[PDB]
């Protein structure tokens, strides 16, 4: 029963240096490959460095050899990843994997053991709560949401109604404004003729600042 | 170049002409087989290739667990000696903390070295099979990983290949409880064998004599299971040194004889108790009473001094004067007059007492010569089959010449009065005296 | 350097039909060291095939790699449900790790025109300095679209972020927010805000627009 288990999320400022984790249990750091991989938000899968137990040699890519370093404790069986001078263009989840692969003459293995991840978001941002600006409506059925704007740090949870409203709901995903806070929309679909009736609230919740706002959503001609 | 005298006063056979080979010592050798501290591993894959290698490596991982389980005539003149005794010293030398290391350094680069162990005997070391180096550098580190996978089937048969030895070596030493003898191909193939005897510290007419006839070096080798530590795999193999060679050695084949009398139980009996072989030996003569335990391989003779007496050279006397006053020869006493005939060299010994029908066949045609009662000798020459009662004996047909040596049945000379009739193991100055007490003492009575 | 590339982008297909996931990489890489990889949105990398074509151990038989040289393919002879995710492709040389674009599995649907509507700036957030105008591209099919600005038919240019949602669980369509974030005094200096759809299955684009007033 091997298990990879990373330290958890960090956020840190321009110019600044991480540690991020990767424990080892149920197995010895001595015979593992240990390779750090990292995913921006939305993009694809992009490699870093790593450690070869077998050789106890480490390896880095060019493109951050300047600027990071892989530490292999075999003691602990604990790999740590150092990476300085931070920018906006490192905000990634990073993960430790075992990308090895060994081989001989009689054949070639390898081992696929992962952690869990370690986001790491990295803005000069502090704390903030959102504004929520409506998306008021205007043939046989209307759009209308709200915007979720100017928010630090993620997440941000939208229902609607109190959760009543469910069908034709689409909450987008945020988006990392050039300001350095996340914004998001959330949009619902109903038919036309329901909005001279049926009053609609979003309801938005940001927890890191206890920030909630029930936002109601009228038509606008 | 062999002869053969018949005896027909004693009813006894001589067959000279013979090359000595006896086994005066003994020769110990360190066979090594490097191993493989291997364990349950963590490819458990269901490719077909995967599957099968699975499998054989535990043939070699049991094969292991099997080793580690194992280290936790006048024949009643004969001696008893232990024969591994030499080998099984060896062994407990290897034991000794230190001298397994000797071995692996010795023969860490080298397929073969000389080795002195800690008592100061220099032994031949030879490392046989490299299953360590096949399967810790191109298997194992593809077993202890998560997912595997084989690259080629040749693979798989090749292993075979590699594993099967180790197997069959196991086999035997499981079966035989670590001393195994004749010592198969297995334990030593011909080529390791030979290269073992021209390394030995021996005569180059030692070397000459054991390269020839390699299947009775083998009959006469034992291999010892020894010691199983670190990663090596020791055995010891005892091969025999032979110290005495080429001294003339000869044959001596013996049968009752009885009187002649028709009536029954009315018969004294008398055998000859000192066949088997015997060879020159520093000035003395070896004599093996089982001839069963020497084996004769053309003119030469291989036997092992485990199973002789060391008798004086006038015993080769009691062959044409059986009485004599240098030696006292041995003889048996009984009154069982039964036939049976005993196969020479170059002919066959027939006794034919009683109402038995003895006879002397051919090939073209059966019973070309009949006998009468007693005890008579054909030679091999132009006689191929011999049947004495319901037992039919085939002669050797192996070429020589035959001599008839007449004389008087010596048992005419002695009073079937009080002839002592249980006589198991005496002598004719024994008989002469176990005459004169019944008859010397009973006359003056 | 050793530069992989991956084809196609989005491979749409429904379960019981083959998937052919190509992978082409600009010099030889060795066929030892060759693996892909799924993820699904959320979890880590799942290793599938190494080695170009051994299996790796518990993935189903519908998995088969092949490829030498320069070019490389992973096949899936029919598709499960929990198949549809994003397939990479990792080359090695010398210990140095690439990793492939990646490719898409998508679910396939008859396709679907987007619902364009467009919202312009609350009242509300004005009165703070910025404007932001939202166009939602609502349900549709499949995910390639591409949305235009147009300011008083002035082509927009580095002001909008567009963000997409996951291929909806039940119908399987895509939903788009792109949104325009402008100055207060930029928004209140132009007229006619339009937002411009182009999408396979709309015949010709369609546009929605706004004046200020
Ligand atoms: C399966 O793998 C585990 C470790 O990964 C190992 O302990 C176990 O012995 C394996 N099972 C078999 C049948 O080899």
Known sequence: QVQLVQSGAEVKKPGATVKVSCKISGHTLIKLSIHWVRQAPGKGLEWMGGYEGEVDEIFYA?????????????????????????????????????????????????????????????????????????????????????????????????????????????????VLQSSGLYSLSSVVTVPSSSLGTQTYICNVNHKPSNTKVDKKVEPKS | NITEEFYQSTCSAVSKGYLSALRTGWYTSVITIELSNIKENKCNGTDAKVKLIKQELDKYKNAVTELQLLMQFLGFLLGVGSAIASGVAVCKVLHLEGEVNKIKSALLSTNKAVVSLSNGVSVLTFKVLDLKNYIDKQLLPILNKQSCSISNIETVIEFQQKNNRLLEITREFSVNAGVTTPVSTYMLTNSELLSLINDMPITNDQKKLMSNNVQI????????MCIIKEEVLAYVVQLPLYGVIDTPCWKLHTSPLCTTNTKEGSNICLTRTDRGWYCDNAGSVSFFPQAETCKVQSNRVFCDTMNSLTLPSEVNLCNVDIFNPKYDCKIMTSKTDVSSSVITSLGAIVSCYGKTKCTASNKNRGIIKTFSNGCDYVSNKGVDTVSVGNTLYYVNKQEGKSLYVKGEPIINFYDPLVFPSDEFDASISQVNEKINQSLAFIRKS | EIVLTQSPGTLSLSPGERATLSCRASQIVSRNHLAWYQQKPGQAPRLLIFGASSRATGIPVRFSGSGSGTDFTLTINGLAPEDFAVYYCLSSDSSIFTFGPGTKVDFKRTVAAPSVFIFPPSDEQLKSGTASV????????????????????????????????????????????????????????????????????????????????
């Not at chain 1, 790491?120 to 043939?139: E, I, R």
């Not at chain 3, 099919?141 to 600005?149: F, G, L, M, S, T």
């Open chain 3, 134 to 213: 939202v166009c939602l591209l609502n349900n549709f099919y499949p995910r390639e679209a591409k949305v235009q600005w147009k300011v008083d038919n002035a082509l927009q240019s580095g002001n909008s972020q567009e963000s997409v949602t996951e291929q909806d669980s039940k119908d399987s369509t895509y939903s788009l927010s792109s949104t325009l974030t402008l100055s207060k005094a930029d928004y209140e200096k132009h007229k006619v805000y339009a937002c411009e759809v182009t999408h396979q299955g709309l015949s010709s684009p369609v546009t929605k627009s706004f004046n200020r007033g």
């Open chain 2, 217 to 224: 070096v083998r009959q006469q080798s034992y291999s010892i």
């Open chain 1, 62 to 174: 060019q493109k951050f050899q300047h600027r990071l370093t892989v530490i292999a404790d075999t003691a602990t069986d604990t790999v740590y990843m150092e990476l300085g001078r931070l920018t906006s263009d490192d905000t990634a989840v990073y993960f430790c994997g075992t990308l090895g692969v060994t081989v001989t003459e009689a054949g070639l293995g390898i081992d696929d053991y992962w952690g869990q991840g370690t986001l790491v978001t990295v803005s000069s941002a502090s704390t903030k709560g959102p504004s929520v600006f409506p998306l008021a409506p205007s043939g046989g059925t209307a759009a209308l949401g709200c915007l979720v704007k100017d928010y630090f740090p993620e997440p941000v949870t939208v229902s609607w109604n109190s959760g009543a409203l469910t069908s034709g709901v689409h909450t987008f995903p945020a």
